[PDB]
C-alpha cells in the first residue's frame, strides 16, 4: 500500500521544485493556455488566422517578437524563431533539474540536443485544440486546416504535431504532471554519444519515482497512466525522427539574430 513517509515527501518536494522551475522557464503554462482556448480568461482574446485574408490582417494586428514574399516561408520562419526561443527556455528548465548541471558539460549538451524536439511536441500540445494552435504568447490562434492548406512541403509540417496532441491532450495532464514528464525525457541515458550514462540513469530513476507518485496522486481515474506516459515518450522518439527527416527536405529544397 502507499504511505506518506520521508521518501514520498522528498518525491513531492522534487515535484514542487520542478513545477516552480517549469512556471519560471515557460511563461505560458498549460493552465493559462487552456483558459485562453476555452474563453475562460479575462486576458486579451486571441486574433484568429483561418484563411489568407486573416493571415495578411494578422501579420499587422498580432504583435510578433521577430522584427520572403511567400506566406508559407514567412510562417515557417516565424516557426523557426519560436523554436530557438523554446530551446533556450528548455535549457533554462534543464539547469534547475537536481543533478543536471553537475553532469559532464558535453553530456548536458547531448541530452538537450536529442531532447528538445520531443519536449517541443510535448509543449505544443498544451497550446493546441482540435481547431488550431495558440501563437505569439497567446495573442494569436492559427487553425489546423489553414496550416494544412499551405503548399508542399509546409502544409504537412504541423499535421503530425496535431495528431500527437489530440491523443496526448486526452490524458488531461496538468503543468505539475508535465514538469516531471519533461524532466524524465531530458534525463534519457540512451542518447547517442553520452560519456557517463550511470549518473544520468540515477537522476532519471528518481524522476520516474516522482512522476509515478505525481500521477497516482493527481489521476485517480487512470491507474496505468504512468505506463501510458512512458508509451508516449517511446512514440515521441519515432515522431521526432520523421520531424528531422522533413526539416532536411526543407533545408535542401527551399531557400535568428542570436545565431548571428
Amino acid at each position: 500500500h502507499m504511505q506518506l513517509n520521508p521518501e514520498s515527501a522528498d518525491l513531492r518536494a522534487l515535484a514542487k521544485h520542478l513545477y516552480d522551475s517549469y512556471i519560471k522557464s515557460f511563461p505560458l503554462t498549460k493552465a493559462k493556455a487552456r483558459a485562453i482556448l476555452t474563453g475562460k480568461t479575462t486576458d486579451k482574446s486571441p486574433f484568429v488566422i483561418y484563411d489568407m485574408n486573416s493571415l495578411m490582417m494578422g501579420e499587422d494586428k498580432i504583435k510578433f517578437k521577430h522584427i520572403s514574399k511567400e506566406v508559407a516561408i514567412r510562417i515557417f520562419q516565424g516557426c523557426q524563431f519560436r523554436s530557438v526561443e523554446a530551446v533556450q527556455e528548455i535549457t533554462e528548465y534543464a539547469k534547475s533539474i537536481p543533478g543536471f548541471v553537475n553532469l559532464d558539460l558535453n553530456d548536458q549538451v547531448t541530452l538537450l540536443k536529442y531532447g528538445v524536439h520531443e519536449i517541443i511536441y510535448t509543449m505544443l500540445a498544451s497550446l493546441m485544440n482540435k481547431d488550431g494552435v495558440l501563437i505569439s504568447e497567446g495573442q494569436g490562434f492559427m487553425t489546423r486546416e489553414f496550416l494544412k492548406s499551405l503548399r508542399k512541403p509546409f502544409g504537412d509540417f504541423m499535421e503530425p504535431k496535431f495528431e500527437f496532441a489530440v491523443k496526448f491532450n486526452a490524458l488531461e495532464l496538468d503543468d505539475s504532471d508535465l514538469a516531471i514528464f519533461i524532466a524524465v525525457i531530458i534525463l534519457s541515458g540512451d542518447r547517442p554519444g553520452l560519456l557517463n550514462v550511470k549518473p544520468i540513469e540515477d537522476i532519471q530513476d528518481n524522476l520516474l519515482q516522482a512522476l509515478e507518485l505525481q500521477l497516482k496522486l493527481n489521476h485517480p481515474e487512470s491507474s496505468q497512466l504512468f505506463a501510458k506516459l512512458l508509451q508516449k515518450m517511446t512514440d515521441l522518439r519515432q515522431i521526432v525522427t520523421e520531424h528531422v527527416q522533413l526539416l532536411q527536405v526543407i533545408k535542401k529544397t527551399e531557400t535568428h539574430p542570436l545565431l548571428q
Binding site: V87, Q88, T91, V109
Partner: peptide, 11 residues
Amino acid sequence: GLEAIIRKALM
C-alpha cells in the same frame, strides 16, 4: 545551430 544555442544558454 542547435548545439550553439544550447551551449550559449547553458553558460
